[PDB]
Design a protein around this ligand. Structure first.
Ligand SMILES: [Mg+2]
Ligand SMILES: [Mg+2]
Ligand SMILES: [Mg+2]
Ligand SMILES: [Mg+2]
Ligand SMILES: [Mg+2]
Ligand SMILES: [Mg+2]
Ligand SMILES: [Mg+2]
Ligand SMILES: [Mg+2]
Ligand SMILES: [Mg+2]
Ligand SMILES: [Mg+2]
Ligand SMILES: [Mg+2]
Ligand SMILES: [Mg+2]
Ligand SMILES: [Mg+2]
Ligand SMILES: [Mg+2]
Ligand SMILES: [Mg+2]
Ligand SMILES: [Mg+2]
Ligand SMILES: [Mg+2]
Ligand SMILES: [Mg+2]
Ligand SMILES: [Mg+2]
Ligand SMILES: [Mg+2]
Ligand SMILES: [Mg+2]
Ligand SMILES: [Mg+2]
Ligand SMILES: [Mg+2]
Ligand SMILES: [Mg+2]
Ligand SMILES: [Mg+2]
Ligand SMILES: [Mg+2]
Ligand SMILES: [Mg+2]
Ligand SMILES: [Mg+2]
Ligand SMILES: [Mg+2]
Ligand SMILES: [Mg+2]
Ligand SMILES: [Mg+2]
Ligand SMILES: [Mg+2]
Ligand SMILES: [Mg+2]
Ligand SMILES: [Mg+2]
Ligand SMILES: [Mg+2]
Ligand SMILES: [Mg+2]
Ligand SMILES: [Mg+2]
Ligand SMILES: [Mg+2]
Ligand SMILES: [Mg+2]
Ligand SMILES: [Mg+2]
Ligand SMILES: [Mg+2]
Ligand SMILES: [Mg+2]
Ligand SMILES: [Mg+2]
Ligand SMILES: [Mg+2]
Ligand SMILES: [Mg+2]
Ligand SMILES: [Mg+2]
Ligand SMILES: [Mg+2]
Ligand SMILES: [Mg+2]
Ligand SMILES: [Mg+2]
Ligand SMILES: [Mg+2]
Ligand SMILES: [Mg+2]
Ligand SMILES: [Mg+2]
Ligand SMILES: [Mg+2]
Ligand SMILES: [Mg+2]
Lengths: 50, 95, 101, 76
RNA sequence: AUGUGCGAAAGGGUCCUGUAAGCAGUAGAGUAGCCUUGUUGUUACGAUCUGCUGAGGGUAAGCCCUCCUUCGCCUAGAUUU
RNA sequence: ACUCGUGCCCCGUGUGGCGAAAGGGAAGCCGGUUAAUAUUCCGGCACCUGGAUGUGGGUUUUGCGCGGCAACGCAACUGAACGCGGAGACGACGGCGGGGGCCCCGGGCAGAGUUCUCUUUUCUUCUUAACGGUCUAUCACCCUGGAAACAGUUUGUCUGGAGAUAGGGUUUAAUGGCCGGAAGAGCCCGACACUUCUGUCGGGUCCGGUGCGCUCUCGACGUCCCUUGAAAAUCCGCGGGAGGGAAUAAUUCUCACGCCAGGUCGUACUCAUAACCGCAGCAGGUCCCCAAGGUGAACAGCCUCUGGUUGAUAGAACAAUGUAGAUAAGGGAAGUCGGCAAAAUAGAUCCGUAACUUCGGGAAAAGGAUUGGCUCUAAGGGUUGGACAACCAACUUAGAACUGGUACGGACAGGGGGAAUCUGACUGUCUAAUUAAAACAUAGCAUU
RNA sequence: GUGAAGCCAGAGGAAACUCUGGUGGAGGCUCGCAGCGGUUCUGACGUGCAAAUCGAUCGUCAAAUCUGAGCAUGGGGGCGAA
């Protein structure tokens, strides 16, 4: 809702900041195995528990 | 060429609904570059964006019926659906 | 008796020779209504022209400049000049014809 | 906003230390002249019906505080 | 694939409905607004009625006729034996 | 109370926190602005709370205002403890009255639509915030006076020797009038600049009426209860009278003006046939606010304006069987476990209405007639003159003639009815997802 | 829609209380819209739109009416117009 607590707002901020694809230069490092962001979350797919 | 943004901005600027906003069919490319309320106002002043007039809705037939009923033309027993008290309350008459 | 003054200015189309001022004057004669009746001018309304492409309206009743504009539009529609001529007002009691096409 | 009834109280208000500015609004259609002075809390308006008293009040007002004439169609 | 051809209109016929829009009345229960002392006083509203008007509208979409009503079209294109 | 914090003197019955983004509660409105925020930004114009000390004003000098018969008034006009009171602070419903907004009607202004013909025509605009000043606005209260031949009075009631009618006042109560705000805004027209930088400049922005209208709010009445419909924080008044108050100087001031400050967190967007929950972009579910015109009793159905959509895989054809919507000659339940389904009835006005009954009902019992259009007539009000005339204003009812398709609640909307039996008195409740019932509950009765 | 108390007026009679016009606006009254519910079609659907929905028809609709948020009762426990 528009009414939010500071804690809830902060956690939403953290989720928004984590919602991104991985950097491209990561895949160029030696020994890299990360192909894509496996913890990607979408507001329509997976509900975050507050 | 997508003009939904232009239609929304023109509706906001003109204070009408988006169904009354008229965009020039022959100036679509020029209108698509507006992107701002100042430019929308400029296009409105230039006449490329126009607020369409409201759809007609007249009360002439209602007024004619009211006058005909004043002279008593459409108030027979076949024109009444409510009871006598619903049409003219006895309490109001007594008051 | 109170007197009201109106002016209809057709100077531009009159000079361009597309507006017939005398025909318009006779149109007011045959169309203006007093007491809900046509042909009852009865010296309460006088509609003589004043030469310079203008028709002058003396009224001794509550004759309305919009009735006048309505009659002017009716005459323009009758003579088929609505597509080029329009009736505008810029000050009190004066309506003139202007080209727009 | 507050209305000032008489010229003496209006000028006494204009002499105040907190008087910031003043402006004359001329309404020719009503033949009215309004002298408005902006103080800290309130805007004080004095209404006059003639131009002679308006001119004499304008020339008798304190000269330190600035006076404007309210141009038609004030810009944003 | 030149035809008693095919198609689109139109016309006529058949059929269905029921007398179109507009104009005019001395027909219309009446009413009003100016005058001539009325006998149509001239007008202005008025469901409706009468005449033009068995009119007008529709009619093959699975109705009929038109080698001499009108306007178009044609001896193809492709596949297989 | 001291140069310095630490020396004392009074009161005491109490002596925690959390708990409402719909309860209580200090204070902000208008215009403009962005791609996306705005009662938060910008401009103008305000308010509240707290703290400080000024200028003016008022009061006094052994003292703490003045006026009014009074209700009370006025710009202030001292007031500790201790106490008293008020506000916060309260149900549901009914009719009535006032106010705002909306709707409607008339005239005018500007623009637009129509204009074979007709239409002084149809539509749209014509605005005024918070905050203040000023004048009013029912109930109540005060003064005079003393009422039966009782009077005043509401739609309803009620009121009066515990003092009515009447006359004159005081006062609570603006979403009322005028003024400031404020036309400088907003809006509407009209005319001149131009790659842009700049738009610029003219004008206008009105007056009335109406009402069982809709919505909100306020007021005075009234009804119901074996039902009587929060608390606290906070704010105010008073009883009391503790302290203190330089005849040439401050003045323990709720008056006017003036000075300083107001931290923290939320604020996008959706709120749903796609932003939530139902595994999903699911015909389900999910709490509110605002609420136009016509018909009509009516937020019924049906049509329309503003606003919003035109989104739900498409094209062609029209077999059977379907799903949904209907119609059928004659018969009219012969069908079937069973009138299941469907049909029939239906609004309003006027007639007429049985058995039975707990006298309240039954009852819309049963049944019958009328209903359109047009042209008229009558009645039902307010104001002024001088018993009539004139002016103003809506609707509601009744009567008559004419007329057509013998039709008129022309769509929509809208009871089938009666004679009985079993059963539960009735209203109400339950097996969410096969049972709504005669089951449960109930008032009443009785027992412990 | 019906029209309970209370109230006004007029008729009778001798009394007492009879009657008749009105006013009024009571009721776990009634028709009926929204809401709430869920009778029948034993309709649709029945690998559905849906792990209970859809349509028509129905019950109730001013009070044992409907409903939000906060709070309480926790498994042999709770709560139950059962
Ligand atoms: Mg009514
Ligand atoms: Mg033919
Ligand atoms: Mg004809
Ligand atoms: Mg004929
Ligand atoms: Mg024919
Ligand atoms: Mg081959
Ligand atoms: Mg708390
Ligand atoms: Mg609150
Ligand atoms: Mg501010
Ligand atoms: Mg600002
Ligand atoms: Mg302060
Ligand atoms: Mg002093
Ligand atoms: Mg409360
Ligand atoms: Mg209405
Ligand atoms: Mg009007
Ligand atoms: Mg104002
Ligand atoms: Mg008195
Ligand atoms: Mg003003
Ligand atoms: Mg102006
Ligand atoms: Mg309400
Ligand atoms: Mg009202
Ligand atoms: Mg928002
Ligand atoms: Mg979901
Ligand atoms: Mg849903
Ligand atoms: Mg309506
Ligand atoms: Mg009506
Ligand atoms: Mg309706
Ligand atoms: Mg929308
Ligand atoms: Mg689909
Ligand atoms: Mg069938
Ligand atoms: Mg049959
Ligand atoms: Mg038959
Ligand atoms: Mg039969
Ligand atoms: Mg049988
Ligand atoms: Mg059989
Ligand atoms: Mg049935
Ligand atoms: Mg039926
Ligand atoms: Mg009875
Ligand atoms: Mg019976
Ligand atoms: Mg009957
Ligand atoms: Mg008749
Ligand atoms: Mg009938
Ligand atoms: Mg029924
Ligand atoms: Mg029962
Ligand atoms: Mg229950
Ligand atoms: Mg069940
Ligand atoms: Mg079970
Ligand atoms: Mg069931
Ligand atoms: Mg009931
Ligand atoms: Mg339901
Ligand atoms: Mg079934
Ligand atoms: Mg199936
Ligand atoms: Mg269902
Ligand atoms: Mg059906």
């Amino acid at each position: 809702p528009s009414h939010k607590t500071f804690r809830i707002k902060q956690k939403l901020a953290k989720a928004q900041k984590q919602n991104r694809p991985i950097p491209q230069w990561i895949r160029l490092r030696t020994g890299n195995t990360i192909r894509y962001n496996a913890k990607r979350r979408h507001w329509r797919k997976t509900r975050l528990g507050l | 060429v997508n003009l939904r943004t232009q239609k929304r901005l023109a509706a906001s600027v003109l204070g009408c609904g988006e169904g009354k906003v008229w965009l020039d069919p022959n100036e679509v490319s020029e209108i698509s570059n507006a992107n701002s309320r100042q430019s929308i106002r400029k296009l409105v002043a230039d006449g490329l964006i126009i607020k369409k007039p409201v759809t007609m809705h007249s009360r002439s037939r209602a007024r004619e019926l009211n006058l005909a009923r004043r002279i008593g033309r459409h108030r027979g027993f076949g024109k009444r659906k409510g009871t006598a008290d619903a049409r003219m309350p006895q309490q109001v008459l007594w008051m | 008796k109170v007197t009201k003054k109106f002016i209809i200015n057709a100077s531009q189309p009159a000079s361009d020779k597309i507006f017939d001022v005398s025909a318009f004057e006779k149109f007011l004669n045959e169309r203006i209504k007093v007491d809900g009746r046509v042909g009852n001018l009865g010296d309460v309304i006088k509609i003589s022209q004043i030469g310079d492409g203008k028709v002058e309206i003396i009224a001794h009743n509550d004759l309305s400049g919009r009735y006048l504009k309505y009659l002017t539009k009716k005459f323009l529609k009758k003579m088929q000049l609505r597509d080029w001529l329009r009736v505008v007002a810029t000050s009190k009691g004066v309506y003139e014809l202007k080209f727009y096409n | 906003p507050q209305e000032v009834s008489d010229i003496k109280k209006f000028i006494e208000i204009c002499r105040r230390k907190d008087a910031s500015s003043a402006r004359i609004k001329k309404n020719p259609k009503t033949q009215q002249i309004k002298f408005k002075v902006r103080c800290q809390r309130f805007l004080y308006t004095l209404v006059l019906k003639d131009s002679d008293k308006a001119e004499k009040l304008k020339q008798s007002l304190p000269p330190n505080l600035q006076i404007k004439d309210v141009p038609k169609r004030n810009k944003r």
